[model samples]
Target chain A: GLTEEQRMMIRELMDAQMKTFDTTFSHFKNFRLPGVLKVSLQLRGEDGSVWNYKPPAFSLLPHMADMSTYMFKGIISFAKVISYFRDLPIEDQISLLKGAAFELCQLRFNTVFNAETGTWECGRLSYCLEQQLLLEPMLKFHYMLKKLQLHEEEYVLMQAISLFSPDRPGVLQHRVVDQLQEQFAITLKSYIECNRPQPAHRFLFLKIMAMLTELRSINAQHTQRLLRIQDIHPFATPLMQELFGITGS
Target chain B: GLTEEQRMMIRELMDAQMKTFDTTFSHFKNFRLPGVLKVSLQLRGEDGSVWNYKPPAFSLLPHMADMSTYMFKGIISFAKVISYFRDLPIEDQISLLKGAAFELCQLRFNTVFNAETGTWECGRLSYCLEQQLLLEPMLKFHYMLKKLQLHEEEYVLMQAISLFSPDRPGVLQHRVVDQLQEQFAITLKSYIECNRPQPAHRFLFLKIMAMLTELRSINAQHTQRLLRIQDIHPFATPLMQELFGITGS
Candidate 1:
């Protein structure tokens, strides 16, 4: 989202870089990020050869190439900033964000901040050992990119799982309760099939189901601004809330 | 939300143990854990404090937990029907489903299998696992129990996050990001203050947004579903799939 119209006033804010920095920093001041990654990993056995795992091919290289490509880039100011400021007042927060934009660009883009001052830096593009300070954080990022260059063919291995997983390579153990449950389900189904209902029994289950729903919904509770529960089975709350064993709407 | 039969069913379905398992796994799952931890031990005197930061707390623990859990409670299922004599000549999928239920159950539950012997053993519990088998997976299930007990604090941490999460953290940064898309958001207030538009000018912004949305859906080629590039926009998709990322909404 556009935070400002600095672009319209670009001419007056020359050192255009500096104006952009202010805008960028101004933006970062309000930026927030959630701290987590939602990912699931499936283990690969020894037979699941490394050569067979295909990488997610997004034009986005190595899946992580240009690791900071999506990093929000912004303008930054360098002069009159970068000094340690205590408590970092509002103004300084903005400055730091702007400075960070510059810093990020130097770090992520390898913008050559100016080798003379050592303040200028960026990305993993061939910086000297002395200049490693700027790009070390991104080394793994570089490795991730390199790993992408080698393709893994997982589709074939997955086919193998479907083909070979069914040798009954081991014994099957039944959950004791499940055995009872299976019997109960089969008996219920067979009984219903064998015993034709009389006229009176027609839709008895259905009519009772309707009455049953009306009988429910009375256990709802108020939680602050919310109905702690909603229009669901009366038993759902305790069950879903962990008071009981199992329940589904 | 209940005191009736349906509620009782919910109680059966959502029993405390099931809820606990789901909650714990999800909590442990939330950390944006790096797939593998890498350390260089390159504490060069020159880098000093910059390189001296301690490893992140339990940065490696979640993976350990994931692998162990996957092996423990994770199901391994299979289903097939091969008979020497079949009276029915018609092809039957129902029979297929029925025929494989046992295999399905066995594969769906890892603890029900005898890893050492290929046999169909009756279970003591019938639904989940036999206590004896839980101990047999290298006696590792005990560790999960320990983790479950020790992880009480983590659940509280999750509750804290679940309770306090703002509807929009896009305007901020959290401890981490779970999944990422580069759709940066903007500050409406800053945009307005910077622009200081006239009423007529301001009114056009709404039209601009509506037009952009219309243009997208109308012009898109990959419109099997989502109009946007992302099949699911983080902000909106969870609304339909889960009660997430909303300030207790």
Candidate 2:
């Protein structure tokens, strides 16, 4: 059994970490704007005429690229506050964050996804991203996740799990990273078992794990599509460039 | 957040299940008799003369077989008491228990292993299984695990994780099984984080997980060796026959 001091330490650490995660990234709630004005902008006369928009040339890619960069920064700040993550060797820190940044972004975005309308509501703008090949699968994932109605604690715990994966390429301390991932994974399961409804208690953990797997699938697809997007119009931000491994401007 | 009722229910369920596991198999502590007498029996005249023993013919296989059957029964009773296990379909129950029985036995035996002497002290007898091909690897695993000095809570939780494996052959409810395993896995991690010391906190969870992997390897070796033993001298018990799939004997 833990000494009272040890128990208090663990409890404070977990609670503080969860609160930190929620506070640092809770800007996602501001992204949940009502209506689809952002998506309908291309159809409106004033903006279309001012921008000289052509139907074929109108793309949400730029908005998505910018949103992704912001989300990437949020993940970095979120990871920075974690003492264990900060304790890692610099190289491992880079590898783990780079490997998981996009996945973490998706999880954050899932929180603000308007499932009924199948749009991502982000800071007074809504993204339907209808033309992007990745949208359908991602929206499907969002819908499935939104159904669970996960609390802030579960979301942060899963993000921690996703972030600490030992198998990320170039990880130097697999044992340490693996332990971290397992710790958060265990925490997520405990939270679910403790809080979810009776019927949900039976399969919610498995479903969430399955959703992580699907998130990976979406992540992979997003990478491929992003690379294709970069071929035509290069990513605007250095952060996105680093995240996507897009070299040479 | 869980209501007070929900929190009490989860707390009681986890505690009661762990206690049941400990009680159902606490007989392992009695198996920790001091001395190498069982292994040194051949050198003593009284037993050797009465049995007219020969060096090549004296095998610990029978004793191990009997011990394993008892441990398997203990695992069965332990599983029988878990409400979730009872909720599983009968076929799933059989598949889960059969797939994991040997591995669970290894975990149970781990608790009684005398690492310093490199022997399994079981119920007034000690088994070195020196002539067996598996003894060396098994001893190494035991020594490594003994270093951790896991508590009863960790032990039973690990046993639960091993038992609820979704990938076991013939399992129909993979998702349900997966959730149960994840729940116990989370419990084990939580227990470790709350209870273990500083250095142990860093890597013990991973080490324990790695130990489970090693346990699976030992389990595989045990099955192969047990099958070979059955090929020569048939198993005496029906349960052993069923466990090892030694049909028609």
Candidate 3:
């Protein structure tokens, strides 16, 4: 029902924004690497005759700390890319930042979860932290995303959708914010339908909505688990907590 | 994370809006009484001596017709209550209406769908149209809603939540629309947490998100069935198609 002019405006804005975001944060390489990050150094043997690399035994605490740090950093890097909203009301910007950060972070975690190969990267390390106890839910969440068969563009739009959240509480002009989100969602749907010749593409829209719901579930539990990790070791920095929405305060 | 002033604004907006909607719609007055609308008249008995009343034989086609009408009408009634969005871009408004109407309508239907009573006044009539054939999925959907045990205000907020979908395709200001929705969602979460003395209320926020996913699944197949009815009977009017989004076109 939009006037052709308004429709053109929306299309152009969406096109430009999607293009910029897709290209902007490729430097944030940590998103692709989620599990136990480690450094190895060759050491001389006791007799100083052997040079062998030593892999540190996986410890739960430091792994969680590293994972949280990676996720938090990814969230901040994403926010930087969306800094066009920097001039918006501070309340609006902050709410979106807080509400969206966890969802977006969890989604990135989902993308590289790599459950099929049983790989223990940063993705699984955070979930596997409680001595591999928490990995069950993490495995399922990752598997669901993989089963959806999302493409590069879908991932980009999904990340953008999480960033452009107008539904975050305390937004000053939620109505206006929602317009961007809707535009992105529609673009994602159109992109999928147009590119895929499968009839199942129609259901992708519903699946995308379900993906967010699944991410919310995973993120809520993940954050809680992160808090529990913070309880004993106290590893999360203040910026880490703020970026990952650890404190409801 | 909302400031005191922002919290007050959200509280007041939610309280006023819930009041208006709850007052505007009643449970039993009929959501346009969609399926097989019928009236009875007194008639002479076979012997012409005793007066008697007979119920019309249950017909599949009219029942389907009736069900679609109810759903279509429910969507419009929801739109009217949220008419404050009238000034939003027309495309955004219509896209939200189209994309969300079925899901919102399904929530209302699910709210009243009582699985235990085996009722048909409103609950399972649409599902049981073809001699209880539609019962399986309907039972599951109804049971899920019941399991949630949402409070009246919670249901009201959930209905509104479905209506103000910022993620709908073609929305120009999805962020803005989502802000309105997120406020409602946060208010609903807080309302549940504050009102209930139980620990389970803590998950209400996540449950609200899950409810939308469940509703999407239920509404998807439900509308497909309606479309089948239309194909067979060719009964849906232009306005009906417009209201229910029967055509992908």
Candidate 4:
């Protein structure tokens, strides 16, 4: 249980830290450069049918590189606000970062989601995954989040909540981080109760978490692709080495 | 990233925790009681055209109640490994549970997905969402996971990884859980490399995480329906309350 003082301390720290970033998490835009990769996947079904999935032809390398950059930036965006938790054992910090990174990215992308357009916007332009293969997953992802229609504040709080995951596998001081997340969740809940027409929307919090989990799944796919590039190119920026390195958190 | 000893610890812990339940996460069969609810959802397109969607005619209350029970047991099934995170300030536990419960449940459902039959099975009997509205999203989710074709070990390890999410909003000791997840992930990687014919299959981890993200989206719909049932019924089993409770986690 955090004292009012501790909660206030966190609130102030998060507020100040949150101020450091652009209001919208548009980091995805930075990597919106053009490229294409022809990707093909062959899936063997239980019925012994071969299903071949081929993405519209495009260059995958540049896109993956852009993705790598976007991922690092996403991690750094939250690095400062939660630096307070960095005081955590190095292992804990890495664990937290590794665990939280994808969800944070998902929330960021969700914030800028243009539901009417059914496209994720990057500033003035709406870019589809250059690889048509990516379109299916991203499309479904966008539709689902769009369905939620989370307000900006809800998105912000959900992002913050995503970053401080205490249950991540081996967290050492689960209690400490757990308390911070609790305080924030309660704050978000009360905020929802005060601000929204539907107070029963409190359960929406659970939905947000589910979204984070989904994002993590997306991250799994992204990370796999990026890791392959890492081996091939080995051109990680210094920060990339730091933020997404094996122990980046 | 983790030593063999850590991997051993995780394998043993997960094995014990997983054994606490039926070998599969098929809580759906438990509530196979018969019933149905006729449901329909209309989505208005940007062009102002309305699309009407309908489920097979059936009573939904019993199905929803069945779902509510499935969700609770799904979380409780992981009670031991995640129990440590539970001790965090109660709020923290709720946040973590709120975030992960659905994803974990999603993975449980995914493990036994049979692609060939195009059916989601619980045992001798196969089932479909009574709310056919869920059919589309779940169709996509099952396809992606089915493509992964994870082995029994792979599925088990993935479930453990999903539960120990460190990015859970507000976690104080994320690093601890992070390490545990990293260990499991690494173990999975090595396991894939050694056991599978193709080492490239290792990256399927990313796809699995992405699958979970989509599953979360499905949860958005699933939870909403169950909560509606919750308000109408105001009655849930004790275990149900514990797993799917408003603040149960």
Q: Write the per-residue lDDT of candidate 3 for residues B107-192, one digit (tens) a residue.
A: 66666554565333342122322124435675566666777788666776776678788877678888878888887787777776
Every candidate's fraction of true contacts kept comes to 0.00, 0.00, 0.00, 0.00
Residue lDDT tens for model 1, A86-141: 22344433433322321233222323333344322232111222334323333322
Candidate 4 retains true contacts at a fraction of 0.00
Output the chain A TM-score of model 1: 0.17
> DockQ of every model listed?
0.01, 0.00, 0.00, 0.01
Residue-level lDDT of model 4, residues A96-179, one tens digit each, is 776666566666666666666544554433333322343566567767777877666676677667767787767888988788
Best by lDDT: 2
Candidate 3 DockQ, CA atoms: 0.00
**What is the alpha-carbon lDDT of model 3 when measured against the actual structure?**
0.58
Please provide TM-scores computed only on chain A for all of the candidate models, following their numbering. 0.17, 0.76, 0.66, 0.65
TM-score of candidate 3 on Cα atoms, chains taken together = 0.37
- Candidate 2 shows a clash count of 2
Query: What is candidate 2's TM-score against the reference?
Result: 0.41
Model 4 spans with C-alpha error above 4 angstroms: A1-249, B1-3, B24-32, B35-58, B67-71, B81-94, B128-135, B197-202, B228-249
What tier of docking accuracy does candidate 3 attain? Answer: incorrect
Each candidate: what lDDT?
Answer: 0.25, 0.66, 0.58, 0.58
- Local error of candidate 4 at residue B143 (angstroms): 2.3
